[PDB]
Amino acid sequence: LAFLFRGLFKNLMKEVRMYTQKFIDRGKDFNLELAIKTNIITDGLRYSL
DNA sequence: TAACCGCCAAGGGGATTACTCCCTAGTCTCCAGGCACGTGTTTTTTTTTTTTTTTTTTTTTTTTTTTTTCCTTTTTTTTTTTTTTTT
């Protein structure tokens, strides 16, 4: 479960980086609650279990 | 201290004259090795076919039967409608 947490945390950081990179090039700010997709870790753990 | 010079003495052999003789210069005449020409048979090069190991590819993995579980996409870009602001 630690290894799955590593993989899902890396995927979550990649998605957060993608979101803030596509919302940083226009000069505007971003929302931290809208930045994190909460379904990724829960969906991955549910599928792998 | 003996080179050098002067003086004297002795002898040895190269120069000279003559006689001889014998070996080569010259001239035919026969014939045979020396040389010009042709070429070879080994030597190197090139192909040719095989050999031998390595590497890669491909195919395979006893049969029958009965229950669940999860999934049978998903984000990402483009479009299209809606709403708000301005003159």
In angstroms, the Cα distances linking A42 to A6, A8, A31, A45, A48 are 13, 9, 21, 5, 10
* Nucleotide nearest the Cα atom of A22 (by C1'): B76
Protein contacts of strand B with Cβ less than 7 Å away: A 15, 18, 22, 39, 46-47
Q: Which residues contact A14 (CB under 8 A, 6 or more apart)?
A: none
Q: Which nucleotide is nearest to A46 (CA to C1')?
A: B70
Q: Is A24 left (phi over 0), alpha (psi -120 to 50) or beta?
A: alpha
3-state SS class at A3? helix
Picking from A20, A13, A48, A21, the residue whose alpha carbon sits closest to that of residue A34 is A20
Kindly state the tokens that stand for A39.
Answer: 């379904």
Contact A38, A6 (CB under 8 A): no
Resolution of this PDB entry, in A?
7.8
CA distance A34 to A9: 17
Q: Is the CB of residue A44 less than 8 Å from the CB of residue A8?
A: yes
What is the distance in angstroms measured between the alpha-carbon CA of A29 and the sugar C1' of B40? Answer: 102
Q: What method did the depositors use to determine the structure?
A: cryo-EM
